[PDB]
Design a protein around this ligand. Sequence first.
Ligand SMILES: [Mg+2]
Lengths: 419, 452
Amino acid sequence: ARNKIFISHAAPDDNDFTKWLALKLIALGYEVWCDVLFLDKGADFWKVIDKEIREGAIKFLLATSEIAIKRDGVLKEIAVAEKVKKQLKDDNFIIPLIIDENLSYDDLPPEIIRLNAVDFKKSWAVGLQDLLKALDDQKVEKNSPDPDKSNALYQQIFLHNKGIIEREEIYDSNWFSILSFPKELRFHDYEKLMPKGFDVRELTYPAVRYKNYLCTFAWEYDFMHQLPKTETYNSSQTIRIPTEEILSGKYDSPFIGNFECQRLIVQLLNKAFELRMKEKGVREYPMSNKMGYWFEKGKLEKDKFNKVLLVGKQKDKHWHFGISAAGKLYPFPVLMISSHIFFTKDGKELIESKKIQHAARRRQGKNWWNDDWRNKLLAFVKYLSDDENSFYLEVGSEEKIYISNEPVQFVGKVSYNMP
Amino acid sequence: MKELIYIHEPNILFANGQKCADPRDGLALFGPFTKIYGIKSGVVGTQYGLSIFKNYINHIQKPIYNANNITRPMFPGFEAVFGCKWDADNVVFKEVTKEEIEKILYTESNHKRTYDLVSLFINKIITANKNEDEKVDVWFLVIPDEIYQYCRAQFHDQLKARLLEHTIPTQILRESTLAWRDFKNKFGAPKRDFSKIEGHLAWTISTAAFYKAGGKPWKLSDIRSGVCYLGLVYKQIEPKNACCAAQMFLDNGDGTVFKGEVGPWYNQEKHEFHLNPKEAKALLTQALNSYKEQNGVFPKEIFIHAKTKFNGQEWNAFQEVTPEGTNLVGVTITKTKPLKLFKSEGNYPIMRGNAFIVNERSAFLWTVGYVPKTESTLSMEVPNPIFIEINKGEADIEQVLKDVLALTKLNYNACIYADGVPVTLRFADKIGEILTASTELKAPPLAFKYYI
DNA sequence: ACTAATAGATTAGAGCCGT
RNA sequence: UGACGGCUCUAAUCUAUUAGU
Ligand SMILES: [Mg+2]
């Protein structure tokens, strides 16, 4: 029966394309007759070319090119192809596969000009994907010589340009933009009243002694108990600076360059976050270059909050969702909240062995997934939400830094099947 | 709401000018860009290693099935993909007796231990490259596992640098890799399970062997012409810094000339990771001449990228030696800033290619993420993006993002979908690791085939 | 100038597991 | 070192400030 796909092409150059085309179709199980790959030597080729076009061919594929349409021996296969098409009452018989870049549907012979071509000019894999759609639509039967190769090669062709959907998607970051911040940043000259090398870290509110000025948002007479003779200070020596002006990068004062001010603000910001943690009473954990935070076993209700177990157990220890918030001002002031997994054998003291924790951290990590990490982090900050829509950072008696308790959300215009 | 732009995946060429986005697909469907006649193997190892190597090379001639055929493509077979022959019966075997390892193994000094083992393997290779009339293509050193961990100033790094003066491609294969079924940690299960990634393993070794034998498995075509993408990496030497460079650019015939432009440009300065005016001028001059000879005309801009920022004086040196009409772009690509974008609903991480334009001179680009075609992330969890900032020069922050993603498609040491960092910053890292692992060679080879 | 300290910054390296 | 990714532990440099020599 006619169950063979004939291929016509120019003799010298089309071989490369046709050879790849012929083998792929054979590998898919499509029976194929090529004038160079299946023509026995010494045969009367027109006798067998004509005969099989009439009798053996069920599809006719023409490798269309700038010379394959000017080749006398190819049009003869076309001319008989049209005739056998007529008797077979199959309009979808001749499929003029266009491969040449310079051939664009305006020098094609009238015989195939009425027909719908399959485009290979830009990419052979997609053009062959078009053919498989065309052949499968017409229910062209193909055998299954090696079923595994046929299915696999079909999938390789099938999934060539796919997986980029135009659907919008929303991404939850670990960035938490600051909502509020003090209006005025103040340099206190408590120097005259400050003990030599008075630890500035012991203060209730964050204050950095830039030069001889205690850079802080805190109100002047705030550290009355902590710092003696605080009230004796004169507010004249305090240097008021508009905070929003710094964040705009416009306060290029000779006294302090703008760049240094933000780094102090971040220094204040990170310290204030740490100071708030003691108020929130979260157990901390030193790191290689950072400071960890988490909730002790039993502190949180069932060691879970917002339907998320911030505290769990792995092996002989207890895994704890660790965090290390870091401040950033460029370009949008944001307090990044990271994600970690600390481990405690009794649920309280953390395994001192760094090797055991790090090995444990990886074992726990290979369990949590994108969604799980999102749930754990957002539940953690939600527990830290002072307000129902933010959490503040006390930097003074009446100065506060509200920061959005929800993470900054990014929007993208491309998604995938997400199987 | 911050909007993320999407960077389209650049295409890597294959046979017949055909383009595909996955090297594992464009190779399987279309084949390598340029074919070699065949690969003549050479094995330097124990009798056990030679049997394993002969077993594995014969194994990968035929198609290989991994459990997850849907996601990561199967391996059609070496001759089926690359078109050349890689026969295990043409092995120019050079035996290394296990007892010979023992006497070197027992030396007290670690310096003498690693040097003698390196001298053990390379001497047999070097002699067999001067006395034997066999044209060996790639020398495969099936090293026994005792070499790896008893000898632990690196065996692998020392070996490659000492063979540079002879220009001998080598491909070190640990015996635990080729015979993974036959190495278990007393549990009965392999020390590393390659069962689900057999095709992934066979893909990587084959293209590495194919590349080192003079083959070009694929090349890039999605870059702006007339640009010399030069990548700089600094290595600590113990207060010495060495800064090798790797360049990638199109020739006149639209061919990527992915070569090095290397040397230990030393920085004995207290401030680290920068270049003196003298050293910096030589570095950029070399790449300029290399493009000059490879193309005839000078580049119209030089896309200098690095993981470290550039100060003024070294940038000034670049300006002084730069010819007229040539622009400079300084790009700093770091993988440190934590910007984790968890997907709203689902379990598959953010798709690769998303980009956050922070401003006109910086961006966050997701080179690692979820790849749809492979249907299985090269990563496992939420991927950290790489921060790309235009340190110096005038360039488009969107065009730079495309080029940076483009440079992630020339990893020949593995046939993965794409690499997290641009390969020019990864290959220059490998070169600096290799070069400095021994004495200063007057002229290093510029073919990555001798390093990767 | 040279050291020391408190920071954020920005780099490197080691190394320990996943896939 | 078939590879890749993540993470950990260190370390140094640069900047600011003060102290000290
Ligand atoms: Mg390699």
